[PDB]
Amino acid sequence: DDNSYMYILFVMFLFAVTVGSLILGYTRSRKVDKRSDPYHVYIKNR
Amino acid sequence: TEEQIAEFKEAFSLFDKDGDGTITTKELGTVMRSLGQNPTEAELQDMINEVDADGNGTIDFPEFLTMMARKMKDTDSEEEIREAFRVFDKDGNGYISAAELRHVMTNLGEKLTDEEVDEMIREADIDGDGQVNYEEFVQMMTAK
Amino acid sequence: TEEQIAEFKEAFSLFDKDGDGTITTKELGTVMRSLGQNPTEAELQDMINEVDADGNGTIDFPEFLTMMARKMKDTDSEEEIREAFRVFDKDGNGYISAAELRHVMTNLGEKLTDEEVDEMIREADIDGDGQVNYEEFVQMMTAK
Amino acid sequence: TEEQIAEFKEAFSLFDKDGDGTITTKELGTVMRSLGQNPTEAELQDMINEVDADGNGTIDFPEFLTMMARKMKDTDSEEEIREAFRVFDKDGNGYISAAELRHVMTNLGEKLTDEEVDEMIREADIDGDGQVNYEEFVQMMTAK
Amino acid sequence: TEEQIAEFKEAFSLFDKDGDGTITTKELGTVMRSLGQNPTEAELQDMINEVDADGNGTIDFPEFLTMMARKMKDTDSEEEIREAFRVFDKDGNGYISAAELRHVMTNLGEKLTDEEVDEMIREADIDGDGQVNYEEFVQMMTAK
Amino acid sequence: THVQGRVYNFLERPTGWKCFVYHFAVFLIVLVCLIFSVLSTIEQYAALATGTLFWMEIVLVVFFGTEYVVRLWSAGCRSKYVGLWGRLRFARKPISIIDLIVVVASMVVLCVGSKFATSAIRGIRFLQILRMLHVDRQGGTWRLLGSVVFIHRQELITTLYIGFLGLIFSSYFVYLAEKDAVNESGRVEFGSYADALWWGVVTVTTIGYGDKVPQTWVGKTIASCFSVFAISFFALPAGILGSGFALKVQQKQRQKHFNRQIPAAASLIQTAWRCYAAENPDSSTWKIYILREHHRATIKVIRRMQYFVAKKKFQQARKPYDVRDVIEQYSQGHLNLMVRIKELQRRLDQSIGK
Amino acid sequence: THVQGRVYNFLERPTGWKCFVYHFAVFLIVLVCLIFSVLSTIEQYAALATGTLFWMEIVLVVFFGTEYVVRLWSAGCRSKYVGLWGRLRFARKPISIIDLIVVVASMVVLCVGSKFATSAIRGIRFLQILRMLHVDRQGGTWRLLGSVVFIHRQELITTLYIGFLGLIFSSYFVYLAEKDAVNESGRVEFGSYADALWWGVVTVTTIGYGDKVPQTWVGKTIASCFSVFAISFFALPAGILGSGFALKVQQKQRQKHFNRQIPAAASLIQTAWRCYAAENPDSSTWKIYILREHHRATIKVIRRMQYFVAKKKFQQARKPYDVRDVIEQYSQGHLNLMVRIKELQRRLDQSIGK
Amino acid sequence: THVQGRVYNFLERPTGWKCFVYHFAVFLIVLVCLIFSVLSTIEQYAALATGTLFWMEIVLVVFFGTEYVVRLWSAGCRSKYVGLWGRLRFARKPISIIDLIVVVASMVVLCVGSKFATSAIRGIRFLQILRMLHVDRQGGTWRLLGSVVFIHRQELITTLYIGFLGLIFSSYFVYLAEKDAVNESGRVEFGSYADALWWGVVTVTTIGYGDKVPQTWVGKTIASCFSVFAISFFALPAGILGSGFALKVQQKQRQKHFNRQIPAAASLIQTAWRCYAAENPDSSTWKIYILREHHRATIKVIRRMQYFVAKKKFQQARKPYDVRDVIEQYSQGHLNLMVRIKELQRRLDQSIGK
Amino acid sequence: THVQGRVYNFLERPTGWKCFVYHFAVFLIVLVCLIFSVLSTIEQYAALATGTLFWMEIVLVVFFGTEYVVRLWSAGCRSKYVGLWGRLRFARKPISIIDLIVVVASMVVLCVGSKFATSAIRGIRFLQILRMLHVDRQGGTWRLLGSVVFIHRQELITTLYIGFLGLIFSSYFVYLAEKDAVNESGRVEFGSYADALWWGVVTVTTIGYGDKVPQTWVGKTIASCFSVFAISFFALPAGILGSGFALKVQQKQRQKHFNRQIPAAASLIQTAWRCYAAENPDSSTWKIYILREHHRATIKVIRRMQYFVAKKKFQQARKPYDVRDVIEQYSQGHLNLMVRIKELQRRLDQSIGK
Ligand SMILES: [Ca+2]
Ligand SMILES: [Ca+2]
Ligand SMILES: [Ca+2]
Ligand SMILES: [Ca+2]
Ligand SMILES: [Ca+2]
Ligand SMILES: [Ca+2]
Ligand SMILES: [Ca+2]
Ligand SMILES: [Ca+2]
């Protein structure tokens, strides 16, 4: 078990990347197709 | 801001012509026929279904002021023009000819007036044997 | 039961106007023009192709009594209205504004009369700064 | 064989009415209006595009004699009628009611004459409380 | 080369009939009606949308000289005719009958004149009991 | 007659929740009998095989003989299974043959095994395994598989043919290259063609037990040369069938709904009857229009063409929506509209002049 | 009220970059705690399990108790979660139950393990593994899987049923053929049905460890007979689900965009309210048209039919584009145009004569 | 001439049941000869190789020489294979080259092996394996595979390029990490780059024999790093080709049926002949319309444009139904109808005035 | 200027057969250098590493330094790469960075290794492996993969998340069940969590080396419980990406061909220029129609709406054919035709009366 720890790290890192993209699937989920653009909300305020 | 949107309210009132608050297709067709353009009914409908967001078929005043507020200097609107020039780019190097551009602008699509093409050419860098770099010509009309 | 379906038979006989036993599109169009609605032919056809099940194009009497018997208090018919309100829900919390609802009901789709919207608003819980919980407003019209 | 195809040649000559050798849609429409049927142009076109194989739009004489030669006693043509009865089969057991069949034949699709439905019923085995086995009723019209 | 393209310029000037430099659908329809052909508007449009490459709907002079320059002796244009004969090839061996070809050419598609079919047959190798090898008949009209 | 149809609808074509409870409880009882018959193969639980394997099997075969008699009696509410030959046609459908084989084999084994006793227990275990095969009533699993296998049959013969052909060729090549190589244990690894063929079947389906691995580098070169190409050809049936199932599920969500085929189906019947009504000259079918001997010869032709059109429209009303539906209805609509504009023109001229 | 909605939108339904930093930093901290809790299983790093596994776990359970209290308080900006029963319905959704189980189990383990100490460390390791399961807020991963599994459910029961059925049959056949064969080491290879069933499960999913390989050629024949057929049936769920995901992605690029359902949705509300307005005779809904007791009986019918048409058009405005959309709008357009040409004909006749 | 066509249609392009019996019986005889030639590799059945392997092989090569002579003679009913060069073009198509190679190789081996005797038997076994390759007449299996491989060629070069690139890189990395590790038996596991490359090819296609497993954890880390990514890239050709086959089967059920291309194909011929008829001024093709030297110059142009339109419509009449068919026919129909309404307007004005 | 464009088109964006010969010959030379650098790892051919590995590497790095200088000079025919910053943007694209890293690393290694000598040879072997990565000019392989991975990204995060989550959970469960089991050789099989995690990664991707197999039946039960579910989730990316590639190939055969976007693209330019021409009041763009200060305020609005419509129609002219194209053109055609029938009615009334 000389360089054993590396293998554990290598699995968790990959899982981190997956969950990282998963959270980037939520926070950058813009959902452009509305009648409320941010510029359009700023115009509706005026 | 307010002296801008007052002028946009005046321009909206030029289209409205009553107290309805909406621009129908007939109220736009009468303006375009007073200018002498003779639009088709499908063209008048396509010009309104690009603008409105409620989907009812007319243009309200926040919908009218929204399209007049945002600048053409964007990422999508610049790249679409940069791609539209690449259709008329022989050899793909990023340069088009002067006579080729004058032939394209006065024949294809909307026939642009030759007096207007003479103005269009001299704004862009024409020196170098007739070649013109169209990317500066896109920077001229999108950033300004 | 029987005194209900006798009244539904009378209401069917108001549409039939002869001894045919069927409601054609013309026999419905004459009633809607006597009320003063002026329907399109495609609208008269869409109102009949939702009702009949034989597919022939007219409405028989069990087909007429079937749609008049079932209650709107269902699972599909409640959830479709609960979803139709969520289109007009800014911030998605389950509350819509009073002035926003008055603007939506009198402009979009079928223009609802302002005297009717004044009746529509006061039935629902309006107190709390103009916000209204529309889920109770769906319980009001589906369960009753 | 030859005395059959001579009669089919006579029946073809009733449709041809000139020396063209082809049956157009007008030469079929005039026969169906002399019988008093009033066909639509799309119906006259659908009746010819089922028959011809050259795809030109008219009916030649081998194409006319081909459809008159083959018998309805087949595998496809029997199974399609056996499946068409199963639409009107409540409980799927292979028996339909007499009053239900009389109601279906005189209302849906082509309105069959009540004097013809009275002939249609008594050919089939009606005894047993109004139920009729339609598979023998398909054997009656396909095998004969 | 130049005495060829001068004749093609003369043939273009027969279609142009003004100083526009373009062949519209009306300028082609008038020529085809002066010959006595009576084309449909969709046929006049299909004959022009096969030729032009700018997509504007008219035919310029390099577009007109391009289609008149290339020879039918190709790889695609030979194989399409070699495949079009195989539709009318019973048993697929590469031989078609004389009477069958005379019946096909005078009935299906464009009705070819019988005086023209009499010229069409005798150019090809007809000896051998009425059979004709159509691959030599494709070599005759594509290579020449 | 009513009770016969109700117990037919209960035993075959199930619906409801009570009938779910019935079929799933019968399956659960026969699977518990399977587990208690299977656990006796373990050396610890070998004492369980003597008692409960006889006097529960006889009760279960009484129950599955009684249900078969009740179902075969109750299959007479259908029209096609009536009388002696109807019951004989009900008894020759495949799952009924499976159930009959199970009940007669359990009777034979319980008659023989009551008086050797190990082969009796072995037959009981095989019948307990086989008895779960008739839980799938209606054959809805096997028919769904058979349809998708039949539609994709040419592309499923292609890959299997190329895969088995490569298997034969390279199993012979690896046998030629490795027939004298010696394992590290000392044994000759590939000693026959069946040996290299077991190697090939273990390799191409990506199991790779590792009991037989080629030793010399000529064998490893041929083994990789074959493995890289042929593993895709033995993996293609899963891809073909899976994409076929998914395209069929996508296709069944666009569908001409049921009322669309109701006036078409009736229109198939009437016209067909009218053709059958044509040959009797004294029928009442000649009284629609209101003298003969040549009108009848053209009415027969028009009725046969109407029958063909009605059969075509009934076949179209059962398929899902497609592009030729749009093309067909636009052709019909533009044809009718062009005829009516031609009519308006034909009246406007000669109503005025010029 | 505003701050309650803002911290609800921050904790659940995330958006922005700051909220990405929050959720991903919390996940990264709990995964670093997982790695430092897992590395103590190695014999070299076993000295790390004593110190940092208690006084970091108590801080992490304080942080995940506080976040749960804040989220459950802040779920009151929604309409459906208001009051006691609203909070109780927020607390019975599945990921909230997972988070509650995690925080109460960590409290129980840190109360027991402070006074045996190995089972405490084992419970801490299992909770560190379980605590990553509530990083997926909104359940957007599990719902996307569940939809595609539910749509393709019949074709996914079919292949699993045939695969397990073949597994049972051939595991018994290979047990029958190999129950007396002796390994080269000398041990009996297949000694029970569980033994041959472990062989079957290792074989059909193409793992093939090679610890259990059949020895006699009858067993190898049955093993190949089963392997070649059943490996495709255990590989079909990947093909079915993968082609279902790809067809769904292709379907969502053709889509009726958002404004199309705005005048439809309002048209569902008004008509529905008009039906509810029909039963009160003194409403202002009877004042659109401008005497009674039979006009009302037909206005109720017309309003119910208009409600059904509006509900149908709202259901159509949410689906993607399809062939029946083209067929429906061509039917409506050709119907209106044919009516208008009929109108022009009806006026041109009797405006002139003939 | 008739009998030549009938025996051509019997030997190549089979149809019927008698011709099925012929081809399948010939295949079954050559496969029984294959099995009795293959079973001699087993040590028990080695006595079968002496007798029946010569005096059945000579009869089978007489039968496959006679069938080749009869087929090559009978290929003269086709138009393209007539005369010496026609037979020479029939003899250079690939399956005829395969059959010629088989018959001349069996003649060579039976001439050499009649006077060493083991290499004769080895050549006989390889020819018995090769002789099943020309049972697929018409090449309908290989052409169906080749079409789908050619259509999906860019996406099938992409995954193979990335997969082999990852294979080279990580086989070198695992060789670097494991070149001094010692197996439990004591041997050096990875001793060269060919050794690690055999490991990589066994790993990426998910065989995993387990003869070569990396020992140190650096090697296991690199091995998993490579395995997880590259197994999908070596499994993608099965998914691409399987979904391509299933989409092609779905595409061929929507199809312009045969009569649709009959008046188009004739319209390709006439117009083409009319172009060829244009260059002879004294033809009868100038007599359709009923003086020259400029009408001819425009008739040639109109005939060439009609030829191009006819070729386009013949190419459209062979493809399946698609969206551009709907768009094209709506453009044509709306254009004609708008022209006719314009005509009615142009007559109604100036028939009245205003 | 012309020669600069010609050698740019020769080195990058290849076409012809001579340029195929150039690029494929350069690739073939560097792969022959790779093979002769790799064969020295075998103990037999270790004498080849001394001579040809230095004085061929220096010639190859001279050739790949010269080609990089020529390509970076010749990238000035493009518009975007002109001047100092243009060359600096050409030098920071990824394959140019790869080529620069290769040439400077070969210079460093040949400077160090000329004066230890094993690490020099190791660096030379790694550079010979890396030097094949810039044969893919234009990045046409990686971009095609990246597009399909990006479109299917949510469904490809879903299965990987569920697969790794199941991997973590069941690797811990199998570690708990097998941490004291002893192999037949006598060694402890699963000794840590990294050990069970290597087991899990070998199992779920169906390699199954068989070096680590769980011993007790609790471990085998958990191992099958996990294997059966998670192998499909690690096999789903191949199915998703393969069906995505096949649907993209099917999509690109229906396509709006090139001339369709020629009058649209020009119509995007003119209108855009007209918007830019609106702000200068003394332009010649106000002279189309043939007094002011309110006509200009509405001409600017009409020109901006025409620009938006032209941009929408240019975006539509690049997509393949779809159902919304049919719906859009039928809406436009029926709208124009209904307006013209309304016009004919409006003239026929009041041309007559009534
Ligand atoms: Ca207005
Ligand atoms: Ca609006
Ligand atoms: Ca009536
Ligand atoms: Ca009805
Ligand atoms: Ca005629
Ligand atoms: Ca015909
Ligand atoms: Ca002109
Ligand atoms: Ca042009």
User: Residue ranges of the alpha helices (H) in chain I?
Assistant: 2-11, 18-38, 57-74, 84-90, 94-112, 118-130, 140-151, 153-177, 193-204, 217-251, 262-278, 295-316, 323-348
Strands B131-133 and B95-97: antiparallel
Determine whether G186 is exposed, middle or buried from the number of CB atoms within 10 Å of its CB (0-12, 13-18, 19+).
exposed
> What is the distance between the alpha carbons of residues G317 and G314, in angstroms, rounded to a whole number?
5
Tell the residue number behind the tokens 């697969």, with chain if given: I163
Residue G139: both structure tokens together: 């359940």
B63 to chain A: closest CA residue: A40
Which residue of E88, E107, E112 to mutate against D (max D Cβ within 10 Å)? E107
CA distance G240 to chain H (A): 11
> What is the distance between the alpha carbons of residues B23 and B41, in angstroms, rounded to a whole number?
15
Computed over its alpha carbons, how large is the radius of gyration of chain H? 33
What is the number of the ligand closest to the CA of C13?
A: 3
Closest among F234, F165, F203 to H242, alpha carbons compared: F234
Centroid of ligand 6 to alpha carbon of H310 (angstroms): 20
Q: Which residues of F fall within a CB distance of 8 Å from C54? A: 259, 262-263
Closest among H123, H134, H111 to H37, alpha carbons compared: H123
> What is the distance between the alpha carbons of residues I154 and G140, in angstroms, rounded to a whole number?
10
Q: Tell me if G229 sits within 8 A of G192, measured CB to CB.
A: no
* CA quadruple H115, H116, H121, H126: dihedral, nearest 10: -110
> What is the distance between the alpha carbons of residues F350 and F339, in angstroms, rounded to a whole number?
17
Q: Which residues of H fall within a CB distance of 8 Å from D42? A: none
Contacts of B102 (CB under 8 A, 6+ apart): B117, B121
G: neighbours with 3+ CB pairs under 8 Å? A, B, C, F, H, I
Count, residues in chain F: 354
H: neighbours with 3+ CB pairs under 8 Å? A, D, E, F, G, I
Q: Tell me if H11 sits within 8 A of H71, measured CB to CB.
A: yes
I251 to chain G: closest CA residue: G250
CA distance G326 to chain H (A): 10
3-class SS letters over chain E: CHHHHHHHHHHHHHHHCCCCCCECHHHHHHHHHHCCCCCCHHHHHHHHCCCCCCCCCCECHHHHHHHHHCCCCCCHHHHHHHHHHHHHCCCCCCEEEHHHHHHHHCCCCCCCCHHHHHHHHHHCCCCCCCEEEHHHHHHHHHCC
* CA quadruple F46, F50, F54, F55: dihedral, nearest 10: -110
> What is the distance between the alpha carbons of residues G242 and G239, in angstroms, rounded to a whole number?
5
CB-CB neighbours of F18 under 10 Å: 9
Computed over its alpha carbons, how large is the radius of gyration of chain E? 19
> What is the distance between the alpha carbons of residues G209 and I211, in angstroms, rounded to a whole number?
8
> What is the distance between the alpha carbons of residues I237 and H236, in angstroms, rounded to a whole number?
9
Tell the residue number behind the tokens 């000579």, with chain if given: H58
Q: Tell me if G68 sits within 8 A of G91, measured CB to CB.
A: no
G341 touches chain F (CB under 8 A): yes
> What is the distance between the alpha carbons of residues F178 and F199, in angstroms, rounded to a whole number?
12
Positive or negative torsion for Cα A34, A35, A38, A41: negative
The identity of residue F59, as a single letter, is: V
* F 150-179 residues with CB < 8 A to G: none
* CA quadruple H241, H244, H248, H249: dihedral, nearest 10: 70
Beta strands in G35-180 (DSSP E): none
Closest among I123, E52, G341, B29 to C41, alpha carbons compared: G341
> What is the distance between the alpha carbons of residues H276 and H66, in angstroms, rounded to a whole number?
47
Positive or negative torsion for Cα E31, E37, E42, E48: negative
> What is the distance between the alpha carbons of residues G65 and F256, in angstroms, rounded to a whole number?
55
DSSP string, H261-328: GHHHHHHHHHHHHHHHHHS-TTSSGGGS----SSHHHHHHHHHHHHHHHHHHHHHHTTSPP-HHHHHH
E40 touches chain D (CB under 8 A): no
Verify whether the Cβ–Cβ distance F247 to H245 is below 8 Å: no
- CA angle G56/G61/G65 to nearest 5° reads 155
C-alpha to C-alpha distances, E104 to D52, E84, E110, nearest whole angstrom: 15, 12, 10
F188 strand-pairing partners:
F182
D96 strand-pairing partners:
D132
> What is the distance between the alpha carbons of residues I254 and H321, in angstroms, rounded to a whole number?
11
Closest among G198, G177, G179 to G190, alpha carbons compared: G179
Closest among H243, C52, E14 to F250, alpha carbons compared: H243
Contacts of E26 (CB under 8 A, 6+ apart): none
Q: Which CATH number fits domain B1-68: 1.25.40.10, 3.30.470.20, 1.10.238.10, 3.40.50.300?
A: 1.10.238.10
Closest among G299, G313, G305, G328 to C42, alpha carbons compared: G328
C-alpha to C-alpha distances, I151 to F339, G246, H131, H233, I29, nearest whole angstrom: 49, 10, 48, 17, 38
The DSSP code for D59 is B
The DSSP code for H252 is T
Q: Tell me if F212 sits within 8 A of F187, measured CB to CB.
A: no
Closest among I81, I70, I80, I73 to I22, alpha carbons compared: I70
Closest among C122, C144, C119 to C132, alpha carbons compared: C122
Contacts of H16 (CB under 8 A, 6+ apart): none
Question: Which one of H133, H202, H254 has the shortest CB-CB distance to F323?
Answer: H254
* F316 labelled ligand-binding: no
D95 strand-pairing partners:
D133
Contacts of F236 (CB under 8 A, 6+ apart): F159, H238, H241, H242, H245
Contacts of F10 (CB under 8 A, 6+ apart): F19, F22
Count, residues in chain C: 144
Report how many Cβ contacts below 8 Å link chain B to chain E: 6
What is the number of the ligand closest to the CA of D55?
A: 6
* D74 labelled ligand-binding: no
The identity of residue I185, as a single letter, is: S
Q: Which residues of H fall within a CB distance of 8 Å from E118? A: 284
Q: Which residues of E fall within a CB distance of 8 Å from H299? A: 35
C-alpha to C-alpha distances, D58 to B26, B31, D20, D21, D35, nearest whole angstrom: 49, 54, 11, 10, 21
- Start-to-end C-alpha separation, chain C: 19
Contacts of I298 (CB under 8 A, 6+ apart): B11, B14, B15, B31, B35
Count, residues in chain I: 354
Question: Which one of H217, H221, H225 has the shortest CB-CB distance to A2?
Answer: H217
H243 touches chain I (CB under 8 A): yes
Centroid of ligand 1 to alpha carbon of C115 (angstroms): 22
> What is the distance between the alpha carbons of residues H201 and C1, in angstroms, rounded to a whole number?
79
Closest among I242, H66, I285, I47 to F243, alpha carbons compared: I242
A38 touches chain B (CB under 8 A): no
> What is the distance between the alpha carbons of residues D108 and F259, in angstroms, rounded to a whole number?
11
> What is the distance between the alpha carbons of residues H262 and E104, in angstroms, rounded to a whole number?
10
Q: Tell me if G184 sits within 8 A of F212, measured CB to CB.
A: no
Q: Which residues of H fall within a CB distance of 8 Å from F237? A: 242
Centroid of ligand 7 to alpha carbon of E58 (angstroms): 8
CB-CB neighbours of C23 under 10 Å: 23
Verify whether the Cβ–Cβ distance A43 to B69 is below 8 Å: yes
* D3 labelled ligand-binding: no
DSSP string, F258-315: GGGGHHHHHHHHHHHHHHHHHS-TTSSGGGS----SSHHHHHHHHHHHHHHHHHHHHH
Largest CA distance in chain D: 58
Computed over its alpha carbons, how large is the radius of gyration of chain I? 33
Tell the residue number behind the tokens 């453009």, with chain if given: H331
Closest among C137, C142, C123, C141 to C89, alpha carbons compared: C137
> What is the distance between the alpha carbons of residues F90 and F67, in angstroms, rounded to a whole number?
14
Q: Tell me if H11 sits within 8 A of H70, measured CB to CB.
A: yes
C-alpha to C-alpha distances, I56 to E76, I53, I130, nearest whole angstrom: 49, 6, 17
Residue G259: both structure tokens together: 């404004």
Q: Which residues of F fall within a CB distance of 8 Å from G147? A: none
Determine whether D8 is exposed, middle or buried from the number of CB atoms within 10 Å of its CB (0-12, 13-18, 19+).
middle
With touching defined as 3 or more inter-chain CB pairs under 8 Å, the answer for chains E and G is no
Q: Tell me if D37 sits within 8 A of F274, measured CB to CB.
A: no
> What is the distance between the alpha carbons of residues H124 and H135, in angstroms, rounded to a whole number?
18
E56 touches chain I (CB under 8 A): yes
C: neighbours with 3+ CB pairs under 8 Å? B, D, F, G
Provide the 3-class DSSP secondary structure of residue B109: coil
E50 to chain I: closest CA residue: I259
The identity of residue F207, as a single letter, is: I
The identity of residue C14, as a single letter, is: L
The identity of residue I30, as a single letter, is: V
Burial F116-153 (b: 16+ CB within 10 A, else e): eeeebbebbbbbbbbbbebebeeeebeebbeebeebbe
I1 touches chain E (CB under 8 A): no
Q: Which residues of H fall within a CB distance of 8 Å from G209? A: 210
Q: Which residues of A fall within a CB distance of 8 Å from B66? A: 37, 39-40, 43
- CA angle H7/H13/H17 to nearest 5° reads 80
Residue H184: both structure tokens together: 């439990």
Closest among B25, C55, G334 to F333, alpha carbons compared: G334
D59 touches chain H (CB under 8 A): no
Q: Tell me if B114 sits within 8 A of B106, measured CB to CB.
A: yes
> What is the distance between the alpha carbons of residues I225 and I200, in angstroms, rounded to a whole number?
12
Residues bordering ligand 8, an ion, CB closer than 5 Å: E 52, 54, 60
Largest CA distance in chain A: 67
G220 to chain F: closest CA residue: F198
* Chain-centroid distance, C-alpha A10: 21
What is the number of the ligand closest to the CA of D30?
A: 5
D103 to chain C: closest CA residue: C54
Burial I115-152 (b: 16+ CB within 10 A, else e): eeeeebbebbbbbbbbbbebebeeeebeebbeebeebb
The DSSP code for D96 is E
- CA angle I197/I201/I203 to nearest 5° reads 110
Centroid of ligand 5 to alpha carbon of F338 (angstroms): 23
The DSSP code for H65 is H
Determine whether D70 is exposed, middle or buried from the number of CB atoms within 10 Å of its CB (0-12, 13-18, 19+).
exposed
H263 touches chain G (CB under 8 A): no
Contacts of H50 (CB under 8 A, 6+ apart): none
Residue F25: both structure tokens together: 């409880």
> What is the distance between the alpha carbons of residues H136 and G30, in angstroms, rounded to a whole number?
62
Residue C97: its H or E element = strand C95-97
* E 86-105 residues with CB < 8 A to H: 87-88, 91, 93-95, 104-105
C134 to chain G: closest CA residue: G79
**Which backbone phi and psi does D5 adopt, to 5 degrees?**
-75, -20
Residue H314: both structure tokens together: 């013949």
Centroid of ligand 1 to alpha carbon of C42 (angstroms): 27
Closest among C136, C47, C134 to C84, alpha carbons compared: C134
Centroid of ligand 7 to alpha carbon of E64 (angstroms): 13
Task: Say how many CA atoms lie within 13 Å of H35 toward its Cβ.
Answer: 5
Residue E9: both structure tokens together: 């310029």
CA distance H15 to chain D (A): 22
C-alpha to C-alpha distances, I210 to B100, F210, H98, I252, nearest whole angstrom: 70, 9, 43, 45
G142 touches chain A (CB under 8 A): no
* Chain-centroid distance, C-alpha E9: 21
C-alpha to C-alpha distances, C36 to C24, C32, C41, C116, nearest whole angstrom: 19, 6, 15, 19
Q: Tell me if I177 sits within 8 A of I214, measured CB to CB.
A: yes
> What is the distance between the alpha carbons of residues G2 and D14, in angstroms, rounded to a whole number?
87
I194 touches chain A (CB under 8 A): yes
> What is the distance between the alpha carbons of residues H318 and H260, in angstroms, rounded to a whole number?
9
Q: Tell me if G9 sits within 8 A of G76, measured CB to CB.
A: no
> What is the distance between the alpha carbons of residues G248 and G252, in angstroms, rounded to a whole number?
6
> What is the distance between the alpha carbons of residues F140 and G158, in angstroms, rounded to a whole number?
9
Residue C131: its H or E element = strand C131-133
Count, residues in chain B: 144
Tell the residue number behind the tokens 């009901």, with chain if given: C105
Tell the residue number behind the tokens 């009497």, with chain if given: C61
